[PDB]
Amino acid sequence: MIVIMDNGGQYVHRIWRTLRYLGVETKIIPNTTPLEEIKAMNPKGIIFSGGPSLENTGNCEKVLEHYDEFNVPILGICLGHQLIAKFFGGKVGRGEKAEYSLVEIEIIDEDEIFKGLPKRLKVWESHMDEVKELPPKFKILARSETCPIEAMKHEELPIYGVQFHPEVAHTEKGEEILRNFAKLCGEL
């Protein structure tokens, strides 16, 4: 079971449908779902979805505060990436290109979610906002010309962020990145 916390973005269903296509048990829940209830689902992984506003992240930060009750892989997508960054002591701010487009990224550490993938990928993303200061204890996994932090992970915990939307088909290997993340939740 991969739980997708709905932060209100336009592409949240695509995350769910991608996982379904992959044969992964998954459910979208309101981001305001109480933690106990999230715990009663026995999640093997959690996704913090995109959305319009850091002011509407519901209990995403609460999940991180209580990570010891979960101890499963977490993937933040765009706003989810940014909220993880803020929570862990990094900084988010405006980028230089607010419109969505395909952007080429360079994978600098294939780690887990980029395992087996090419070194450069075009991904569907905006930089209306982005991570400006990496959190302590995190490492960068991918970059682009205008944004050094296109993907990141905690150095010690399976907590991941991507700035772009792997759930959008335009993203090269987007389905594979989601698959790689799901495979992490099935092994430990």
From Swiss-Prot:
Q: What is its EC number?
A: 6.3.5.2
Keyword annotations for this protein, in alphabetical order, are:
ATP-binding, Glutamine amidotransferase, GMP biosynthesis, Ligase, Nucleotide-binding, Purine biosynthesis
Instruction: Report the superkingdom from the record.
Output: Archaea
| Job description of the protein | Catalyzes the synthesis of GMP from XMP.
Q: Does the keyword Ligase apply?
A: yes
**What is the uppermost EC class here?**
ligase
Record-given protein name: GMP synthase [glutamine-hydrolyzing] subunit A
On assembly, the entry states: Heterodimer composed of a glutamine amidotransferase subunit (A) and a GMP-binding subunit (B).
Q: Can you state which reaction this protein catalyses? A: XMP + L-glutamine + ATP + H2O = GMP + L-glutamate + AMP + diphosphate + 2 H(+)
- Domain Glutamine amidotransferase type-1 residue range list: 1-188
Gene Ontology terms, MF aspect: ATP binding; GMP synthase activity
Where along the chain is the active site annotated? 78, 165, 167
Q: In which pathway does it act?
A: Purine metabolism; GMP biosynthesis; GMP from XMP (L-Gln route): step 1/1
The record ties this protein, via InterPro entries, to: Class_I_gatase-like, GATASE, GMP_synth_GATase, GMP_synthase_A
> In which organism is this protein found?
Pyrococcus horikoshii (strain ATCC 700860 / DSM 12428 / JCM 9974 / NBRC 100139 / OT-3)
Residue ranges crossing the lipid bilayer per the database entry: none
What PANTHER family does the annotation carry? GMP SYNTHASE [GLUTAMINE-HYDROLYZING], GMP SYNTHASE-RELATED
**GO cellular component, as recorded:** cytosol
